[PDB]
Amino acid sequence: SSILEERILGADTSVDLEETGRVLSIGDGIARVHGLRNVQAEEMVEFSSGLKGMSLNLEPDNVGVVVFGNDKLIKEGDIVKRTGAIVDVPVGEELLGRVVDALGNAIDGKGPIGSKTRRRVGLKAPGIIPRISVREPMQTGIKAVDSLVPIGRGQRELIIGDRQTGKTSIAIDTIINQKRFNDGTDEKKKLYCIYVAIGQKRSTVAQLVKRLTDADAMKYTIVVSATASDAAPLQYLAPYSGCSMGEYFRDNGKHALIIYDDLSKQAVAYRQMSLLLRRPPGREAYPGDVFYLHSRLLERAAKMNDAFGGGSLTALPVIETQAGDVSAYIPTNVISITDGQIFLETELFYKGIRPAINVGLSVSRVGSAAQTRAMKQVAGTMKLELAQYREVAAFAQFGSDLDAATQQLLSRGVRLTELLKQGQYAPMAIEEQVAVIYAGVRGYLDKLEPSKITKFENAFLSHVISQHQALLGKIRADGKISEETDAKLKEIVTNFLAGFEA
Amino acid sequence: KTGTAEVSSILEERILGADTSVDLEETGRVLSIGDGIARVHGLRNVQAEEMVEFSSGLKGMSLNLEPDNVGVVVFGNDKLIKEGDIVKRTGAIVDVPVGEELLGRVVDALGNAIDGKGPIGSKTRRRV
Amino acid sequence: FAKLVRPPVQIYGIEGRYATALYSAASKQNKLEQVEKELLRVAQILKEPKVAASIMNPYVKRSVKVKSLSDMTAKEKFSPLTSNLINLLAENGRLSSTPGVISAFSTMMSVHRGEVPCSVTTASPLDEATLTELKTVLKSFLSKGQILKLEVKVDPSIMGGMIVRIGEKYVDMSAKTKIQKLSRAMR
Amino acid sequence: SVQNMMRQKEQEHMIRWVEKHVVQSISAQQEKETIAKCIADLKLLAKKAQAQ
Amino acid sequence: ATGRIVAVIGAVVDVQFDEGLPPILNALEVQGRETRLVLEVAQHLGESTVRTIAMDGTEGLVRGQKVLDSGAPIKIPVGPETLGRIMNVIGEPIDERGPIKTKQFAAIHAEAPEFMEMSVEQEILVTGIKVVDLLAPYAKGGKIGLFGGAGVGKTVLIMELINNVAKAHGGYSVFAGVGERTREGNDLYHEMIESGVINLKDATSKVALVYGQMNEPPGARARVALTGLTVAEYFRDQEGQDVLLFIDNIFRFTQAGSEVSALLGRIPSAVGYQPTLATDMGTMQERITTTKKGSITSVQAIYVPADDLTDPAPATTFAHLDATTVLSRAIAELGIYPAVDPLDSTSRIMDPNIVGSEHYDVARGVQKILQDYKSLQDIIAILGMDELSEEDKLTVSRARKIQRFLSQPFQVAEVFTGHLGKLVPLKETIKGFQQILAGEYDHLPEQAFYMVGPIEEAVAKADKLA
Amino acid sequence: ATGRIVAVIGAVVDVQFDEGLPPILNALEVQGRETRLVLEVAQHLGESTVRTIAMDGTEGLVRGQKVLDSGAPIKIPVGPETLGRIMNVIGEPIDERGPIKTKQFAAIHAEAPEFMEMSVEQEILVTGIKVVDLLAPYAKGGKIGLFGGAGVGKTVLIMELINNVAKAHGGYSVFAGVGERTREGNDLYHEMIESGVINLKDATSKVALVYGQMNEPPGARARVALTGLTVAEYFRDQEGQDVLLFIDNIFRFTQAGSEVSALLGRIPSAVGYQPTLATDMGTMQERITTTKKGSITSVQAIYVPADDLTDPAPATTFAHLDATTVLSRAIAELGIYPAVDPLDSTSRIMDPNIVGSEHYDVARGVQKILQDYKSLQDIIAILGMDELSEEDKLTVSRARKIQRFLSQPFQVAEVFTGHLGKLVPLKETIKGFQQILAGEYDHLPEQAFYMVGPIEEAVAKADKLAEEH
Numbered sequence A: 001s002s003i004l005e006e007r008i009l010g011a012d013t014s015v016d017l018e019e020t021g022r023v024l025s026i027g028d029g030i031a032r033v034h035g036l037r038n039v040q041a042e043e044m045v046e047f048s049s050g051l052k053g054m055s056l057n058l059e060p061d062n063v064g065v066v067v068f069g070n071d072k073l074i075k076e077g078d079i080v081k082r083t084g085a086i087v088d089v090p091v092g093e094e095l096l097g098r099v100v101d102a103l104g105n106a107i108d109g110k111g112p113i114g115s116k117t118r119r120r121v122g123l124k125a126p127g128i129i130p131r132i133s134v135r136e137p138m139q140t141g142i143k144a145v146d147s148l149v150p151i152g153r154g155q156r157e158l159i160i161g162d163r164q165t166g167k168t169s170i171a172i173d174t175i176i177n178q179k180r181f182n183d184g185t186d187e188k189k190k191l192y193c194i195y196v197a198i199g200q201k202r203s204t205v206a207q208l209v210k211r212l213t214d215a216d217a218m219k220y221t222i223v224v225s226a227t228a229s230d231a232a233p234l235q236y237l238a239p240y241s242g243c244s245m246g247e248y249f250r251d252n253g254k255h256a257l258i259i260y261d262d263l264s265k266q267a268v269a270y271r272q273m274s275l276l277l278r279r280p281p282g283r284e285a286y287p288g289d290v291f292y293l294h295s296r297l298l299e300r301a302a303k304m305n306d307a308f309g310g311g312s313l314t315a316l317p318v319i320e321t322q323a324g325d326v327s328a329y330i331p332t333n334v335i336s337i338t339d340g341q342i343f344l345e346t347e348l349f350y351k352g353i354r355p356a357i358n359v360g361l362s363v364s365r366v367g368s369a370a371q372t373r374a375m376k377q378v379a380g381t382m383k384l385e386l387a388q389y390r391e392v393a394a395f396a397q398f399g400s401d402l403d404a405a406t407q408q409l410l411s412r413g414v415r416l417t418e419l420l421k422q423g424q425y426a427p428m429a430i431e432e433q434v435a436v437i438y439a440g441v442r443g444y445l446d447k448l449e450p451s452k453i454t455k456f457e458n459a460f461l462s463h464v465i466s467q468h469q470a471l472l473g474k475i476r477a478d479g480k481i482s483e484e485t486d487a488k489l490k491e492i493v494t495n496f497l498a499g500f501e502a
Numbered sequence B: 001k002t003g004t005a006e007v008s009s010i011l012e013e014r015i016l017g018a019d020t021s022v023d024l025e026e027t028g029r030v031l032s033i034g035d036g037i038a039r040v041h042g043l044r045n046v047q048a049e050e051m052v053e054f055s056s057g058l059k060g061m062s063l064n065l066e067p068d069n070v071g072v073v074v075f076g077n078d079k080l081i082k083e084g085d086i087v088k089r090t091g092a093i094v095d096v097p098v099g100e101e102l103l104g105r106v107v108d109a110l111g112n113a114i115d116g117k118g119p120i121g122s123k124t125r126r127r128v
Numbered sequence C: 001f002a003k004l005v006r007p008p009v010q011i012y013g014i015e016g017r018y019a020t021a022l023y024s025a026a027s028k029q030n031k032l033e034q035v036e037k038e039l040l041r042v043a044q045i046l047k048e049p050k051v052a053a054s055i056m057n058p059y060v061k062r063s064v065k066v067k068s069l070s071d072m073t074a075k076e077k078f079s080p081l082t083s084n085l086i087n088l089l090a091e092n093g094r095l096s097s098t099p100g101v102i103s104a105f106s107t108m109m110s111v112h113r114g115e116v117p118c119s120v121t122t123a124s125p126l127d128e129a130t131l132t133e134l135k136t137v138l139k140s141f142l143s144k145g146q147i148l149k150l151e152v153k154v155d156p157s158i159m160g161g162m163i164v165r166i167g168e169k170y171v172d173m174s175a176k177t178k179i180q181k182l183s184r185a186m187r
Numbered sequence D: 001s002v003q004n005m006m007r008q009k010e011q012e013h014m015i016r017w018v019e020k021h022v023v024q025s026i027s028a029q030q031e032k033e034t035i036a037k038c039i040a041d042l043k044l045l046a047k048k049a050q051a052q
Numbered sequence E: 001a002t003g004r005i006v007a008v009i010g011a012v013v014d015v016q017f018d019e020g021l022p023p024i025l026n027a028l029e030v031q032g033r034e035t036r037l038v039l040e041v042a043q044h045l046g047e048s049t050v051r052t053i054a055m056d057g058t059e060g061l062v063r064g065q066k067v068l069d070s071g072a073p074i075k076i077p078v079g080p081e082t083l084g085r086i087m088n089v090i091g092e093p094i095d096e097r098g099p100i101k102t103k104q105f106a107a108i109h110a111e112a113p114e115f116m117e118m119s120v121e122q123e124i125l126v127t128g129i130k131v132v133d134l135l136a137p138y139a140k141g142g143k144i145g146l147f148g149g150a151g152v153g154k155t156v157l158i159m160e161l162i163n164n165v166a167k168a169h170g171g172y173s174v175f176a177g178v179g180e181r182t183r184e185g186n187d188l189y190h191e192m193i194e195s196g197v198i199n200l201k202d203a204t205s206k207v208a209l210v211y212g213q214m215n216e217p218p219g220a221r222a223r224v225a226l227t228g229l230t231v232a233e234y235f236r237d238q239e240g241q242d243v244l245l246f247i248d249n250i251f252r253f254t255q256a257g258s259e260v261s262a263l264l265g266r267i268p269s270a271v272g273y274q275p276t277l278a279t280d281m282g283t284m285q286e287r288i289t290t291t292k293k294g295s296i297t298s299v300q301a302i303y304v305p306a307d308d309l310t311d312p313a314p315a316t317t318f319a320h321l322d323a324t325t326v327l328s329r330a331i332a333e334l335g336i337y338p339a340v341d342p343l344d345s346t347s348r349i350m351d352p353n354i355v356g357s358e359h360y361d362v363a364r365g366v367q368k369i370l371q372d373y374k375s376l377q378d379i380i381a382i383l384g385m386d387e388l389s390e391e392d393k394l395t396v397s398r399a400r401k402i403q404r405f406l407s408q409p410f411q412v413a414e415v416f417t418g419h420l421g422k423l424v425p426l427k428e429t430i431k432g433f434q435q436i437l438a439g440e441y442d443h444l445p446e447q448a449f450y451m452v453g454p455i456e457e458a459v460a461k462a463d464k465l466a
Numbered sequence F: 001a002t003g004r005i006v007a008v009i010g011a012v013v014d015v016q017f018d019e020g021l022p023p024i025l026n027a028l029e030v031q032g033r034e035t036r037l038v039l040e041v042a043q044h045l046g047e048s049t050v051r052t053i054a055m056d057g058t059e060g061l062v063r064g065q066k067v068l069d070s071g072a073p074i075k076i077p078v079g080p081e082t083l084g085r086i087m088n089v090i091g092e093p094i095d096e097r098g099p100i101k102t103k104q105f106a107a108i109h110a111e112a113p114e115f116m117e118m119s120v121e122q123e124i125l126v127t128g129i130k131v132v133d134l135l136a137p138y139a140k141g142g143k144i145g146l147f148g149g150a151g152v153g154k155t156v157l158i159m160e161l162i163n164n165v166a167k168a169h170g171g172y173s174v175f176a177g178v179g180e181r182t183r184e185g186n187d188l189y190h191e192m193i194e195s196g197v198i199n200l201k202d203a204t205s206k207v208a209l210v211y212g213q214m215n216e217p218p219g220a221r222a223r224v225a226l227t228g229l230t231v232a233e234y235f236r237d238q239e240g241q242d243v244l245l246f247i248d249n250i251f252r253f254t255q256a257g258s259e260v261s262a263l264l265g266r267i268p269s270a271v272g273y274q275p276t277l278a279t280d281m282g283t284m285q286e287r288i289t290t291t292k293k294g295s296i297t298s299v300q301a302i303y304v305p306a307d308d309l310t311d312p313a314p315a316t317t318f319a320h321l322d323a324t325t326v327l328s329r330a331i332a333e334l335g336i337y338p339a340v341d342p343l344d345s346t347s348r349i350m351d352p353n354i355v356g357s358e359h360y361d362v363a364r365g366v367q368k369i370l371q372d373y374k375s376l377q378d379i380i381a382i383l384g385m386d387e388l389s390e391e392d393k394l395t396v397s398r399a400r401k402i403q404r405f406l407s408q409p410f411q412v413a414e415v416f417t418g419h420l421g422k423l424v425p426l427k428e429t430i431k432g433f434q435q436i437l438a439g440e441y442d443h444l445p446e447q448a449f450y451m452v453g454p455i456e457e458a459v460a461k462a463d464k465l466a467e468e469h
Ligand SMILES: Nc1ncnc2c1ncn2[C@@H]1O[C@H](COP(=O)(O)OP(=O)(O)OP(=O)(O)O)[C@@H](O)[C@H]1O
Pocket: A162, A163, A164, A165, A166, A167, A168, A169, A170, A354, A355, A422, A423, A424, E319, E347, E348, E349, E350, E351
């Protein structure tokens, strides 16, 4: 076969003097190395068998080293070499559509990635001059997110909640929903995505690449993967490597997005890795600088000014909490780095509100209110009509009857609550959202039954995409819902309501 | 186990000869200062809870009598003490002015004067 | 306190505390090349079934191990500053680590003219025409007025080369280069 | 899907045949090792020359 | 290749070699004992000295006692002759029926499968239990956990998924006992011989057995779970079968790993566990996989310490599962057996396209009526039932008919209470809950929905009391 | 005296000096780097080795590297030419306008002025807010702390007082950013270029900025609290002027001292803080005082972690302050903005001899009717609203009228809510609240009072609601 022989003539057998430190111990991943005089801190050192490692502690006698791999091929008396480089990963657009490990080697088997430029995992966030405020929107296609808790481009938003409530699905409808902009024509409405899998078994990450490839979502993302089987210095290095492929886009013009799933598993890989280096424990045996661990990460998510390129880098960190308690140590340290949050609960998921977003508590510094112009009209009034609902709609035990007074307002909420529910891996558009939200707030649904609105939605939505395609194209193009555009929609809802149930 | 006063400069003179140049019965040099706690090599005759008096003018109080050094808390700033500064003795537990010349005056915790009228005129003392 | 001469090794631990207090004290008065001749004569009288019977015995007395060695260290050959040092270790409780200090003082005194030798690790030994080059082409590297030394250890798992370590250098040319042909199997 | 799987089972066997056969071929030689040592001297003679 | 014992602390023997240091996780053979004593290298403490963890007891060892180097890890005999035989941590027959003669041997320590050897295909394994078929369906090739305290039912539940799945299975089976009691490991031998699964006389046996119980030293309980995990990989990769795997209990892989981690010289993490709690678990659990060469259907019982689900040893197992059956104590104080928490149990195949869109709506619609009974327990406990509306006296009376209609009599529990074990099919539970949600049985009392099988026994039990 | 590096473990570098040992609290200059890395001495260990703390990143630090010495603590620029600038912790420009050309430097380690240099007088200060000016009034020269959790309104309430007071003021102001979001440090640089407080071409700016944010190593997030009140002390002592001190956030000074405590070599105290909490804090919070050479009016934002006020980092700050405004979260969930708790804020000058015996009788009846509310809210949860007597119904209606009237639309909520901003004078604030307690607005709906200014705007809304009915 011609492929094996051409791989062996391209191999370079270069030999040079190394700089070399004999091993004194090896246990549980830490290799105290005698020698290694001129070593830097955070330098990448290379064992004899092909392993790789990073020298963290410097000390007068020994040199502490942690291993990127497995510590059973390493025996006392081995040889540790010097590369001569603080730890760096490859970068580029050439990694797009791949699954890679935490140092940039492909675990999909499509071959060697041809990459040209290398970028550190420990670089610095930009300061005060080269930013700008948040001008643009980032559409998720969820209807409880886009209307009530909008997210700008360049804003760190925290998805927080328990296990098995919707934290991964929320951030995968977002990956799917940008399919419509990426095959379009303008280069400033796209959104290239990145998913970082920390502490997850391979029978979830090889299954999420399936869900992202029938919908052809994988042609514009990267998956940096550090599974639960990996060395504890490989789950620590993963978000600092994934964030550094995001800043190929942001430092060259485009717009990126990055999900850390999750960041409660980049902390217990720092607690273990830095207890076996004999560093004294803090609270819950976490180190002193877990706040400095997350903060030097979540400040690269910038929004540059237009004299640098104007690119953005959103971030969506996921956080799993125990028993729904938000006052823990690692939650509160990362609530106060992000601009806004999305509080996912369990009693919302089980009563029926799915996606289970607490729209009361899901606060957001609105991002210079870049919702969009037409959604401001219909979800401006929706925000207040739902807020009016929640103050007054928690009895479950009625004794008196005020249908002219109270029962009209709470009938507007259940029509807007059951409108907000959604499916899974089928995200809408924004003008298909303006139409369905128009029909809810304008009183055109109070003569239905609430057990029929989820049935009313898909029959409505199929009618407008089929028969009214030139209608929705004037909302997406002109931005606003104009007064003559208010006129045309006034018949369509009432013509359909005249013949919906028959 | 290494011991605090086993540094490379303490052992180095004892290989040369006897320690006649410093007496160590009354004055002792400082091994290591940090965050208001000093370590002093020498001072063999220091009583427990005795004021000492550093080289830069500050004061002290002896709290840890240990088999190779003494650990003394420092009154005041620590940017005046260093490594190699001779410490001396006063010879008593700390004492404060006491009388009726205090009435109407404002004093700190060592009996000094802060209100700027003038020095206290008492003719008595007392151990705290 | 005073400043002291920097030893060119600077080891650490309970050895290098005492093994630098001896190097600094003897470099004063230029007692350096002499004192190694005296430390190699206590390096023979320590190994004795009456001397080592109480140099590491806990239960004799705290005091009588001080007079018994001070009478011993003075009468036979020498009364330098080492007679205070043996009296210094014995007064503190570090008599167990006494062979450690002289093995620490020897490696500290060796580098004042020495090399920290290389380690050729190839195969069954060689002839004179290929070894006297490597005992001379290994002198062309250093170039600082020195007289080199060396160790040899035979290993067959290295199939076809030699490794050498001038200090911490490790120029490796061996049969590791079969594992470097993973790139043929690595796409 | 049959064409690709029979290439993969053949590929790994082809690699190990070249790999496991070279272990004995490098072990048997006894004259070329003396040739291999003098170039190993000449590489080290070349190596220290570019440093100083 | 020889060395002498230098220090002994419990089950952490120190041993100094002179040349030929063993690499990590070799085996060492202690000479001069009546039994076999195998030491497995853990560390390398500097200047030709290793620190080992011993598999059997260390009493009677003296310093200087010789120790010999094997050359390889703990290997066990694996093959088709392992069926019907009981083993221990080093693979010796403890059934007193003679040696195990196979052609090959398998090491205890091997790596994990790669990314491109995973199989994503999901199905449904119908069991015959109503709580699991409806709300949280198991798959055919995925990991399952049964979380529970002490005295709730994590093994009566695992004796059913043998009695319902290992009978109608076609391939082989592997059981492992890690740190649970020994009379229960004797009543699995005298219940699989009687029922034809163990054949003492020829080669027609289906199940293998591997045992390390709660009398061993903690260097054995920490490694018996990697032993049954190796006999259930030969039956996957080299024979190509569809193997089951039942593990009880997998907590003691971790409880007995923080008893030898203090003596290796490590600063402890939170509430007392080892610093490496969640890397050794992700190296044992990352080998129990369905792959492209076979399929292992895991069922693991997991213990929660002092009835706490936020403890670090249970709460890091959750990322390694597919299904989940959190049991509960306060449920089982009422009498609902299997005491499954319907609100805490999940799956990844509960989906309208996989489990069928009719089933998916009885699923989510019966959690909705169950949550709304929980969300009024503040007011019912203080104030009363009698200060409620008329719509919310009809999510209270309908969600007490649904709780009782999740308790089923099991086959293994006939000997306790004297009631016939019932198996329901899948299609007669969906049909039987739509007739409590639509409101057809709102006249029958709630003592009739209790401990019955299919729904026609509920109207029959209601027919009895009159 | 050039030392050498031996042990870089985290952000704690240890150096070894051949000739001259430097004292505690100095500055050291690591050679051979293209950026300026400054290390400050903190301990003396024995055999001429010290234990320092870096002010930057510790990557690329090879052992055996030379270390110079300057002879003093860190020397920043100071003077009049530091106005309309943004500055680093070691006194450098970070805004890309060029260097700071001053003729006077001030080393950042000074001592607290003595007992005989203490101005004693109290005043009042009017900001325009109906909860500050009525219930916890400020003082000209006092010290003011803004408590409360995360997301309750502390960057808004501190940027509204920059609008209210620090534009109508003759003296100068300093904003020191001790570890916060670098996004929020770009608004206030641009919110005050268009508002005239910073002028980028001439020399009539009236503010100075100090910014070390939360992307910085935790040894440099402990010394921007001290670069602040060294520029804000040259304006008080040297020039005889009047200054304002704005610091956000001062909890990041304490909390970045717990990140290097055990790496220095101390045994950690209670819940995880360093054992020198109330000593390194009170070394700093005594240099912010008004002496008899000038005055300082200090406003500091104080993060309360996890809404836990009994935490040791806030509860040792309640003594260095004259005025506390405590924002709660259970109030801002009701839409009331500013979130300020009425029953937990407190000032010293709430006194019938400074604010007058009409201001005092009002604000001790607002707080007395709000504590009368909470004893009724436990009855409503069981008896319901239509069981109460006719006197207790009158209490809840006024108390909900007072609670809605304490809310006020700020001018910086003109991008969040779309309302228009108010600025209420003090004489109207006392008169408006005096009448709701009397009964002279018992005939209105509560939605009139929400988000107005003076009481005459709260009847111009109850007529528009009745016309559009
Ligand atoms: N929009 C939705 N509507 C209804 N159900 C959903 C929706 N999205 C997800 N689910 C279901 O909720 C369950 C949990 O979702 P997901 O796996 O994203 O939770 P998670 O918290 O990320 O899980 P983990 O805790 O393992 O990370 C899944 O079974 C999924 O099918």
